[PDB]
Amino acid sequence: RIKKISIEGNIAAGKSTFVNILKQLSEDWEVVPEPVARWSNLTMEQKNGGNVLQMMYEKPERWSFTFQTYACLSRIRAQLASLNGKLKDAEKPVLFFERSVYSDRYIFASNLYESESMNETEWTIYQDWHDWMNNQFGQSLELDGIIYLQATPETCLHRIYLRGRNEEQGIPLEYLEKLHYKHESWLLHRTLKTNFDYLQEVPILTLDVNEDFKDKYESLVEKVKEFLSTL
Amino acid sequence: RIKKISIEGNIAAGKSTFVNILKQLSEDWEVVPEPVARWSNLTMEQKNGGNVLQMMYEKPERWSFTFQTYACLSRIRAQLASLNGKLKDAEKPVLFFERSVYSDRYIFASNLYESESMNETEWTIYQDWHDWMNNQFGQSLELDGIIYLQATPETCLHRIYLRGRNEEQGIPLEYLEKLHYKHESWLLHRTLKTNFDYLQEVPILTLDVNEDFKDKYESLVEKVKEFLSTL
Ligand SMILES: COc1ccc(-c2nc([C@@H](C)Sc3nc(N)cc(N)n3)c(C)s2)cc1OCCNS(C)(=O)=O
Ligand SMILES: COc1ccc(-c2nc([C@@H](C)Sc3nc(N)cc(N)n3)c(C)s2)cc1OCCNS(C)(=O)=O
Ligand SMILES: O=c1ccn([C@@H]2O[C@H](COP(=O)(O)OP(=O)(O)O)[C@@H](O)[C@H]2O)c(=O)[nH]1
Ligand SMILES: O=c1ccn([C@@H]2O[C@H](COP(=O)(O)OP(=O)(O)O)[C@@H](O)[C@H]2O)c(=O)[nH]1
């Protein structure tokens, strides 16, 4: 009954800002933030995530698999818990996912493999887990639609300094460009091959979010509302 | 419907010997062989198995987390298969697991952590991963009984050569000595309090497999049948 919409976008694309805006508008609207985001600041996960985040930065080809599996584990666990608890007795329930399990695997896990931070065995193992996981663990999480907060890797680099996380300051431009490339394959050119069948027939809303929208987001919300009404 | 029993014991204790004996004595009885043992001798899982297994020996401090995660997952999957693809409408169906998800954690993963082949984060993430993998996927796997095969480290080292595998050939005796202790404490002495409360209440049969029983096992088997009638 609860519709699941994933908000996809590059680093500092403005996903957290967009969903914070979206959540306030409708009582029937809720949001599952990306678990990794809370790691970048006390649970067992926070400490585990905190440590594994720092280790990841420091030595990626040692910690990509560990980080990536734990990241996706946490996402699934958070998104399931939001499905149960949140949005009780609402008439038109919408759950906005800050990124999805598919961005976990087909963007960030994929990028780390191709940037050699995971060897073949690790990539093969991760995928096998991921594939199996989303059958005997994460069936109810399948998306109804996708909101692609589309922006150039140039725009994204601009917004990284604005938030000021003494770790992301080190993130370069070619990195953004490769993440962007993989977004467009999956979400604009709809190129990317995925083992998930229903994804090829999942509605996608692409929003150009290069122009600042923090105080001017009505046009964006209007599209989302229009997008939702066709689901 | 299906009785689920875990056959436990140190490396080369005789577990595979015993389960293949049990196998041919009844069509109510079926076996779920161990993945890690299956890896040691090739599908997608087996191709991954051999590699991480091979790397696990070359560098335990690098690959223990990765190995323990895939071994447990490949086990959870494998016993799930038998549990849903066997013993249909059988009159007294029993399934004999070669080790369990508890052996994975509290025997092997725990000892690798103790041997500093996993750091705190890897080990805590695994425990986090373990708690949730087994509940949000493997509830139907709860054990109705455990059968402990007890052998000396010397007996095992023997049999390691007898079995042949030069990938495990000169397994240090002291390795066998520590695994032996963790088995003893969990199953016999019962000091090990797991995170699965019911394990402290699950009945345990203990069998001495020091003596060659390959052509003389009727006594052991009689104890199994008596044991099964209690469950
Ligand atoms: C060479 O060292 C690296 C060190 C760290 C990274 C990191 N990527 C990330 C995330 C983008 S991975 C991630 N996975 C998810 N599943 C979700 C999510 N939000 N983030 C870090 C937190 S750290 C990536 C690195 O390299 C990427 C390839 N080389 S590069 C930066 O373009 O010169
Ligand atoms: C130091 O080099 C090692 C090299 C290989 C291992 C291996 N352990 C194993 C298994 C016994 S771990 C295992 N975990 C499972 N979950 C299941 C299973 N069947 N086996 C291998 C297949 S390889 C273990 C190693 O050290 C383990 C600790 N030795 S010690 C003397 O206690 O410090
Ligand atoms: O329309 C926008 C979009 C982004 N930002 C800034 O860009 C940064 C990105 O923040 P956010 O966490 O939302 O990016 P995310 O990683 O979630 O995509 C923040 O400092 C925002 O203040 C902004 O000022 N206006
Ligand atoms: O009573 C026995 C049990 C074991 N074996 C041999 O010891 C080796 C290791 O036994 P097993 O694989 O059953 O031990 P596991 O590791 O499976 O617990 C095998 O080659 C068996 O042929 C034996 O000779 N007599």
Curated annotation (Swiss-Prot), chains A, B:
InterPro entries: DCK/DGK (IPR002624), Deoxyribonucleoside_kinase (IPR050566), DNK_dom (IPR031314), P-loop_NTPase (IPR027417). The modification Phosphoserine is found at E45. The modification Phosphothreonine is found at T43. It comes from the Eukaryota. It is an enzyme of class 2 (transferase). Its EC number is 2.7.1.74, 2.7.1.76, 2.7.1.113. Keywords: ATP-binding, Kinase, Nucleotide-binding, Nucleus, Phosphoprotein, Transferase. The keyword Iron does not apply. One of its GO terms (cellular component) is cytosol. GO terms for molecular function: ATP binding; cytidine kinase activity; deoxyadenosine kinase activity; deoxycytidine kinase activity; deoxyguanosine kinase activity; protein homodimerization activity. Substrate binds at E34, Y57, Q68, R99, D104, E168. The active site is at E98. Changing A71V: Strongly increased catalytic efficiency towards deoxycytidine. It catalyses: 2'-deoxycytidine + a ribonucleoside 5'-triphosphate = dCMP + a ribonucleoside 5'-diphosphate + H(+); 2'-deoxyadenosine + ATP = dAMP + ADP + H(+); 2'-deoxyguanosine + ATP = dGMP + ADP + H(+). It is found in: Nucleus. The keyword Chaperone does not apply. GO terms for biological process: dAMP salvage; nucleoside phosphate biosynthetic process; pyrimidine nucleotide metabolic process. ATP binds at residues 9-17, 159-163, 211-213. Belongs to the DCK/DGK family. Phosphorylates the deoxyribonucleosides deoxycytidine, deoxyguanosine and deoxyadenosine. Has broad substrate specificity, and does not display selectivity based on the chirality of the substrate. It is also an essential enzyme for the phosphorylation of numerous nucleoside analogs widely employed as antiviral and chemotherapeutic agents. Homodimer. This is Deoxycytidine kinase. It comes from Homo sapiens (Human).
